[PDB]
Amino acid sequence: KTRVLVVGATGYIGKRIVRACLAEGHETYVLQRPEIGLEIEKVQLFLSFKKLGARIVEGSFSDHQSLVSAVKLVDVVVSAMSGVHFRSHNILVQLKLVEAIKEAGNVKRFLPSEFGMDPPRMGHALPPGRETFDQKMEVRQAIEAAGIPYTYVVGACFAAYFAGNLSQMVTLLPPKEKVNIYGDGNVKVVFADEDDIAKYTAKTLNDPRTLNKTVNIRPPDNVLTQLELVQIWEKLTGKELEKTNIAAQDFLANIEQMEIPHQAGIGHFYHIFYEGCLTDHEVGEDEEASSLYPDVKYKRMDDYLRMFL
Amino acid sequence: KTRVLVVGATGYIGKRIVRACLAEGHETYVLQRPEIGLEIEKVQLFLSFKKLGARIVEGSFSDHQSLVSAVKLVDVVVSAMSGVHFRSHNILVQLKLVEAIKEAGNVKRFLPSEFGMDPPRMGHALPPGRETFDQKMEVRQAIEAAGIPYTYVVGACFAAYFAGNLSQMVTLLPPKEKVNIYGDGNVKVVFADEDDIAKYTAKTLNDPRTLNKTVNIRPPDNVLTQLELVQIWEKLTGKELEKTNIAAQDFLANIEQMEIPHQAGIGHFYHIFYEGCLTDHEVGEDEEASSLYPDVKYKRMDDYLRMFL
Ligand SMILES: NC(=O)C1=CN([C@@H]2O[C@H](COP(=O)(O)OP(=O)(O)OC[C@H]3O[C@@H](n4cnc5c(N)ncnc54)[C@H](OP(=O)(O)O)[C@@H]3O)[C@@H](O)[C@H]2O)C=CC1
Ligand SMILES: NC(=O)C1=CN([C@@H]2O[C@H](COP(=O)(O)OP(=O)(O)OC[C@H]3O[C@@H](n4cnc5c(N)ncnc54)[C@H](OP(=O)(O)O)[C@@H]3O)[C@@H](O)[C@H]2O)C=CC1
Ligand SMILES: COc1cc(C[C@@H]2CO[C@@H](c3ccc(O)c(OC)c3)[C@@H]2CO)ccc1O
Ligand SMILES: COc1cc(C[C@@H]2CO[C@@H](c3ccc(O)c(OC)c3)[C@@H]2CO)ccc1O
């Protein structure tokens, strides 16, 4: 019964949001852009969405009228626009989409591409990492300036990027013998399986309790220090890892001599693991997803790491 | 019981060969290379292979000993190494893998990365596209020079690249109103769903009838002219497309001014659609996959194209 349009449908979190919307029973539309011409994995992803019952809606960010038409078909718009420097960081292209939603006036709610650190709380961040949050703030201001109802989904580290590698930056796999601990390893971080993030997103987008709210993904058992996370892995494997503590000053040593996109990653890591930006404030149960949606049995990080044994 | 190592397991046809091996009941091992540790889609494909019961084998082409250890674990090695200019064209990297197989001596059968035009019939091909056939030929020679037993799988266009788009080079989707027909559109081409390619591959690799043989994938109902292909699509949509015929000379015009990848593609298309290299010769029923494996209900191009409706 709720009609949903996913923008960024073939993206990392986008494709999960699409499937979650189908499973939740939303009538699900996905935007197929003409520019994805010889990108076979995108094309075939769209084919798989259609087989599961999504509806293809052709549109382009170079064709304002195509965007107006698309969002005229649905009640809710979810954007999963890219926002990682080593991938691509086109958060501002959502501005065109805000303007199309504005012109069409039928959208009952818009979920912009957030799913990360809470932007309005990042005002002190260092560039170039800072650009992520500034751009997402700009999109927020366009949404609110336009009076578009919204939900902002924030709060958790994607497990594949922070959990599966024991938060080592070099890789996505657990380390074999040795691991770096950022500081003392006693800063609480929030970790969430991306499938759960998508499930929460599909459940909130028509939850009246979250209209015009920020929704935090902070599943209580998944608030863990890096050392706790590394110890979960030592338990599963039965092998202690040689741990080396990294003081902040040595984490950041010579950052100015590194490629921009890596500086941005280092900056994001610093806010999460050294400042603890994901756990340094309180949120109430009325604005936290696992409490809003307790039927969702989120995947705990011991189960998540097991798939790597 | 037959133990198969797939090299190139996350590639386009490779990932399908992995699943087809599992579905066939082979004990299926997949080479996980260290170099792909930061590519999230490859990493998560390996997790997904693992969940289906595939066995991860760590190895690196830059580590001759890791390869020898890897091939020693299995009865059959299948290589799906990249060989397309606008993606990646590392056919000759297989030579390091042939070396490892020769040294290890336990390997009963090797399927090199073929899966297309029959290299030994392409002596007259257009440079630079010629490279694909010269490099696979060089790999064949190393194989036979080592006395490694082989099966060469050849002879069909991948449906995604030549049928889903009605053979329009620009795209992977059917055109909306107009289509280019190459020549008179009456040259016969072989089309095959890539999942059927993978299935025939899984079935042939332990088949005595194809030891040391070329296996042709030429499913009779899928031997189609381009006009025949286009008429399938017009019958599905019920809309006639506006057709433009393109003479060979205009198709090849100014090719020497094209980017090298597009030079390659243009050349391959020419041999397929203008010279009919996939159907200019006959093959026997004892060397044709659909005849050897009539249990396989191969997908016809009308069923294939329905996905796009
Ligand atoms: N730990 C965490 O909490 C994480 C949070 N994030 C955040 O999640 C959100 C999405 O990130 P992610 O999934 O990695 O994004 P992706 O890199 O996967 O890209 C997502 C989509 O953005 C679309 N896109 C890219 N460029 C353009 C363009 N010029 N014009 C139109 N569309 C474009 C594409 O949509 P299409 O399918 O139509 O081609 C693409 O699929 C971001 O806000 C990111 O900051 C991401 C990683 C970690
Ligand atoms: N119409 C037809 O008949 C078609 C024929 N083909 C043929 O199919 C075969 C496979 O092509 P395709 O699926 O497109 O291949 P891909 O481009 O998808 O690459 C396949 C694998 O090659 C590996 N690879 C690439 N570079 C290297 C490298 N330096 N070192 C080690 N491994 C590397 C990777 O293995 P890993 O997973 O370990 O990273 C990659 O997954 C080719 O011979 C191609 O000519 C392809 C398209 C159409
Ligand atoms: C946790 O909130 C966010 C988290 C990200 C995570 C980004 C995820 O991809 C991460 C990453 C970057 C560089 C790396 O070398 C890396 O190694 C695992 C991971 C990024 C770290 O910023 C991006 C935007 C956010 O709002
Ligand atoms: C059919 O036998 C082969 C076929 C290919 C197909 C290549 C597949 O990727 C194809 C492709 C290239 C450029 C394009 O613009 C394209 O548009 C669909 C398709 C290539 C056409 O040559 C490669 C090697 C072969 O041996």
mmCIF file of N, CA and C in Angstrom, chain A residues 190-228:
data_model
loop_
_atom_site.group_PDB
_atom_site.id
_atom_site.type_symbol
_atom_site.label_atom_id
_atom_site.label_comp_id
_atom_site.label_asym_id
_atom_site.label_seq_id
_atom_site.Cartn_x
_atom_site.Cartn_y
_atom_site.Cartn_z
ATOM 1 N N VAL A 190 29.160 2.161 17.410
ATOM 2 C CA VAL A 190 27.935 1.486 17.019
ATOM 3 C C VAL A 190 28.165 0.759 15.704
ATOM 4 N N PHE A 191 27.862 -0.540 15.691
ATOM 5 C CA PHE A 191 27.990 -1.392 14.521
ATOM 6 C C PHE A 191 26.630 -1.950 14.137
ATOM 7 N N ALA A 192 26.330 -1.966 12.845
ATOM 8 C CA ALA A 192 25.088 -2.567 12.393
ATOM 9 C C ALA A 192 25.304 -3.263 11.058
ATOM 10 N N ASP A 193 24.774 -4.485 10.958
ATOM 11 C CA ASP A 193 24.659 -5.202 9.696
ATOM 12 C C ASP A 193 23.848 -4.368 8.720
ATOM 13 N N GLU A 194 24.377 -4.206 7.514
ATOM 14 C CA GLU A 194 23.721 -3.347 6.547
ATOM 15 C C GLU A 194 22.333 -3.859 6.193
ATOM 16 N N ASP A 195 22.123 -5.173 6.249
ATOM 17 C CA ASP A 195 20.785 -5.718 6.033
ATOM 18 C C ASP A 195 19.809 -5.214 7.087
ATOM 19 N N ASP A 196 20.270 -5.086 8.330
ATOM 20 C CA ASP A 196 19.416 -4.535 9.374
ATOM 21 C C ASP A 196 19.163 -3.055 9.146
ATOM 22 N N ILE A 197 20.195 -2.315 8.760
ATOM 23 C CA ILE A 197 19.993 -0.911 8.429
ATOM 24 C C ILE A 197 18.920 -0.777 7.355
ATOM 25 N N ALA A 198 18.969 -1.625 6.328
ATOM 26 C CA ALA A 198 17.946 -1.546 5.294
ATOM 27 C C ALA A 198 16.581 -1.919 5.854
ATOM 28 N N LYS A 199 16.528 -2.956 6.684
ATOM 29 C CA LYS A 199 15.266 -3.366 7.280
ATOM 30 C C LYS A 199 14.680 -2.250 8.139
ATOM 31 N N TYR A 200 15.502 -1.642 8.991
ATOM 32 C CA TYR A 200 15.025 -0.497 9.760
ATOM 33 C C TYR A 200 14.515 0.607 8.847
ATOM 34 N N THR A 201 15.230 0.875 7.751
ATOM 35 C CA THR A 201 14.814 1.941 6.850
ATOM 36 C C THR A 201 13.444 1.650 6.258
ATOM 37 N N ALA A 202 13.209 0.405 5.852
ATOM 38 C CA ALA A 202 11.924 0.085 5.253
ATOM 39 C C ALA A 202 10.809 0.146 6.283
ATOM 40 N N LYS A 203 11.123 -0.103 7.546
ATOM 41 C CA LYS A 203 10.083 -0.077 8.560
ATOM 42 C C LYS A 203 9.777 1.334 9.036
ATOM 43 N N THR A 204 10.730 2.266 8.951
ATOM 44 C CA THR A 204 10.488 3.608 9.477
ATOM 45 C C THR A 204 9.836 4.538 8.469
ATOM 46 N N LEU A 205 10.024 4.290 7.182
ATOM 47 C CA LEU A 205 9.676 5.305 6.205
ATOM 48 C C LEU A 205 8.180 5.602 6.171
ATOM 49 N N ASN A 206 7.339 4.731 6.737
ATOM 50 C CA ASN A 206 5.929 5.066 6.922
ATOM 51 C C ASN A 206 5.507 4.955 8.388
ATOM 52 N N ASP A 207 6.455 5.054 9.310
ATOM 53 C CA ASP A 207 6.164 5.104 10.735
ATOM 54 C C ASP A 207 5.828 6.537 11.130
ATOM 55 N N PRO A 208 4.588 6.817 11.531
ATOM 56 C CA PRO A 208 4.250 8.198 11.908
ATOM 57 C C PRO A 208 5.091 8.702 13.055
ATOM 58 N N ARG A 209 5.609 7.810 13.896
ATOM 59 C CA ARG A 209 6.452 8.261 14.991
ATOM 60 C C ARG A 209 7.790 8.823 14.530
ATOM 61 N N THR A 210 8.127 8.732 13.242
ATOM 62 C CA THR A 210 9.423 9.201 12.764
ATOM 63 C C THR A 210 9.310 10.286 11.700
ATOM 64 N N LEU A 211 8.105 10.722 11.382
ATOM 65 C CA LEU A 211 7.933 11.864 10.507
ATOM 66 C C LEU A 211 8.635 13.075 11.102
ATOM 67 N N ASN A 212 9.526 13.674 10.323
ATOM 68 C CA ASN A 212 10.272 14.858 10.732
ATOM 69 C C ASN A 212 11.164 14.586 11.934
ATOM 70 N N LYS A 213 11.749 13.399 11.973
ATOM 71 C CA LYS A 213 12.634 13.033 13.059
ATOM 72 C C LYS A 213 13.944 12.504 12.510
ATOM 73 N N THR A 214 14.945 12.525 13.372
ATOM 74 C CA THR A 214 16.134 11.721 13.177
ATOM 75 C C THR A 214 15.925 10.369 13.848
ATOM 76 N N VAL A 215 16.214 9.292 13.130
ATOM 77 C CA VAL A 215 16.106 7.963 13.698
ATOM 78 C C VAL A 215 17.515 7.432 13.868
ATOM 79 N N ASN A 216 17.855 7.044 15.095
ATOM 80 C CA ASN A 216 19.169 6.494 15.395
ATOM 81 C C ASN A 216 19.137 4.973 15.319
ATOM 82 N N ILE A 217 20.108 4.410 14.622
ATOM 83 C CA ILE A 217 20.340 2.981 14.622
ATOM 84 C C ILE A 217 21.430 2.721 15.647
ATOM 85 N N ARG A 218 21.022 2.389 16.862
ATOM 86 C CA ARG A 218 21.963 2.077 17.933
ATOM 87 C C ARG A 218 21.461 0.837 18.648
ATOM 88 N N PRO A 219 21.716 -0.344 18.090
ATOM 89 C CA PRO A 219 21.259 -1.576 18.717
ATOM 90 C C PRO A 219 22.099 -1.905 19.931
ATOM 91 N N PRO A 220 21.466 -1.998 21.093
ATOM 92 C CA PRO A 220 22.224 -2.037 22.356
ATOM 93 C C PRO A 220 23.342 -3.063 22.404
ATOM 94 N N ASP A 221 23.120 -4.288 21.925
ATOM 95 C CA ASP A 221 24.197 -5.260 22.010
ATOM 96 C C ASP A 221 25.312 -4.967 21.030
ATOM 97 N N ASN A 222 25.115 -4.032 20.114
ATOM 98 C CA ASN A 222 26.118 -3.726 19.112
ATOM 99 C C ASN A 222 26.864 -2.437 19.413
ATOM 100 N N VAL A 223 26.669 -1.867 20.599
ATOM 101 C CA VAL A 223 27.537 -0.802 21.080
ATOM 102 C C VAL A 223 28.732 -1.471 21.749
ATOM 103 N N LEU A 224 29.899 -1.344 21.124
ATOM 104 C CA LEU A 224 31.068 -2.123 21.482
ATOM 105 C C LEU A 224 32.321 -1.293 21.250
ATOM 106 N N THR A 225 33.311 -1.470 22.111
ATOM 107 C CA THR A 225 34.605 -0.871 21.874
ATOM 108 C C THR A 225 35.366 -1.712 20.876
ATOM 109 N N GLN A 226 36.373 -1.099 20.267
ATOM 110 C CA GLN A 226 37.150 -1.853 19.307
ATOM 111 C C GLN A 226 37.785 -3.052 19.985
ATOM 112 N N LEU A 227 38.227 -2.878 21.229
ATOM 113 C CA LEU A 227 38.835 -3.997 21.933
ATOM 114 C C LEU A 227 37.813 -5.097 22.185
ATOM 115 N N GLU A 228 36.590 -4.728 22.557
ATOM 116 C CA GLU A 228 35.542 -5.736 22.686
ATOM 117 C C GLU A 228 35.337 -6.479 21.373
#
